[PDB]
């Protein structure tokens, strides 16, 4: 099946807890995969304009590890719940992808999660301005704009709204698209 095939692909790239005990400032992100209309999608958030860091920008759910978290996957799930109302029973964490080093002292660990088909986002408006899906295949043929660094522009055909996706968020989206969609018969 589509989902069993995606999970099997993802597991081959799992680094697990290899880098998890290193003494960094630690954040986790959830790369949430949603199956709709017979295709896989990634779920993104638009950060509230009220936030200090990166107001109005597109990013994955997640946040800073806190002492309650059993592990880095727990960070991602706790923060996703706070931000978009995703409950742990609504997500199957499939793997941990390559962590992202930033600012010399920070390590961001991405987890890919399969999201229940009945999930409907309940965003905290203090943190999240918007939630939207992008088909995973978009990231194989994105609409690229140069700002010099590459920015993706995705227009939702449901409503004509264009979102800019860039940086780590764009990079991770492409990675997941490659992992899951490469070398597939039609
Ligand atoms: O903070 C994150 C995870 C995260 C961490 C580090 C970098 C990055 O792009 C995303 N995500 C989020 C998304 C919406 C609102 C709020 Cl309040 C936070």
Curated annotation (Swiss-Prot):
Motif Nudix box positions after renumbering to this chain: 64-85
Tissue specificity statement from the Swiss-Prot or TrEMBL entry: Expressed in liver, kidney, pancreas, pituitary, small intestine, spleen, heart and placenta. Weakly expressed in brain.
Its EC number(s): 3.6.1.-, 3.6.1.77
Nudix hydrolase domain residues: 24-149
Major site of localization recorded for this protein: other
Superkingdom of source: Eukaryota
A biological-process GO annotation: succinyl-CoA catabolic process
Residues that bind Mg(2+): 79, 83
Catalytic activity: hexanoyl-CoA + H2O = hexanoyl-4'-phosphopantetheine + adenosine 3',5'-bisphosphate + 2 H(+); octanoyl-CoA + H2O = S-octanoyl-4'-phosphopantetheine + adenosine 3',5'-bisphosphate + 2 H(+); butanoyl-CoA + H2O = S-butanoyl-4'-phosphopantetheine + adenosine 3',5'-bisphosphate + 2 H(+); decanoyl-CoA + H2O = decanoyl-4'-phosphopantetheine + adenosine 3',5'-bisphosphate + 2 H(+)
Molecular function via GO: coenzyme A diphosphatase activity; magnesium ion binding; manganese ion binding; snoRNA binding
Keywords per UniProt: Hydrolase, Magnesium, Manganese, Metal-binding, Peroxisome, RNA-binding
Annotated site, Important for coenzyme A binding, chain positions: 53
Cofactor: Mn(2+); Mg(2+)
Gene Ontology CC entries for this record: cytosol; peroxisomal matrix; peroxisome
Activity regulation, free text: Inhibited by fluoride.
Modified residues (N6-succinyllysine): 7
General function of this protein: Fatty acyl-coenzyme A (CoA) diphosphatase that hydrolyzes fatty acyl-CoA to yield acyl-4'-phosphopantetheine and adenosine 3',5'-bisphosphate. Cleaves CoA, CoA esters and oxidized CoA with similar efficiencies. Preferentially hydrolyzes medium-chain acyl-CoAs and bile acid-CoAs. Has no activity toward NDP-sugars, CDP-alcohols, (deoxy)nucleoside 5'-triphosphates, nucleoside 5'-di or monophosphates, diadenosine polyphosphates, NAD, NADH, NADP, NADPH or thymidine-5'-monophospho-p-nitrophenyl ester.
Homology family: Belongs to the Nudix hydrolase family. PCD1 subfamily.
Protein name: Peroxisomal coenzyme A diphosphatase NUDT7
Gene (UniProt): NUDT7
Portion of the full-length sequence here: 14 to 209 of 238
């Amino acid at each position: 099946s589509m989902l069993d095939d995606a999970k099997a692909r993802l597991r081959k790239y799992d680094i697990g807890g290899k880098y998890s005990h290193l003494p960094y400032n630690k954040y986790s992100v959830l790369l949430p995969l949603v199956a709709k209309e017979g295709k896989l999608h990634l779920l993104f958030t638009v950060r509230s304009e009220k936030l200090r860091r990166a107001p109005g920008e597109v990013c994955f759910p997640g946040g800073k590890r806190d002492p309650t978290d059993m592990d880095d996957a727990a960070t991602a799930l706790r923060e996703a719940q706070e931000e978009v109302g995703l409950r742990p029973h609504q997500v199957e964490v499939v793997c941990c992808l390559v962590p992202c080093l930033i600012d010399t002292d920070t390590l961001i660990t991405p987890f890919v999660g399969l999201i229940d088909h009945n999930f409907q986002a309940q965003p905290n408006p203090a943190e999240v301005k918007d939630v939207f899906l992008v088909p995973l295949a978009y990231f194989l043929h994105p609409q690229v704009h140069d700002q010099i660094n590459h920015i993706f522009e995705y227009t939702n055909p449901e409503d004509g709204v264009t979102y800019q996706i860039k940086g780590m968020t764009a990079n991770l989206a492409v990675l997941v698209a490659f992992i899951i969609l490469e070398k597939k018969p039609t």
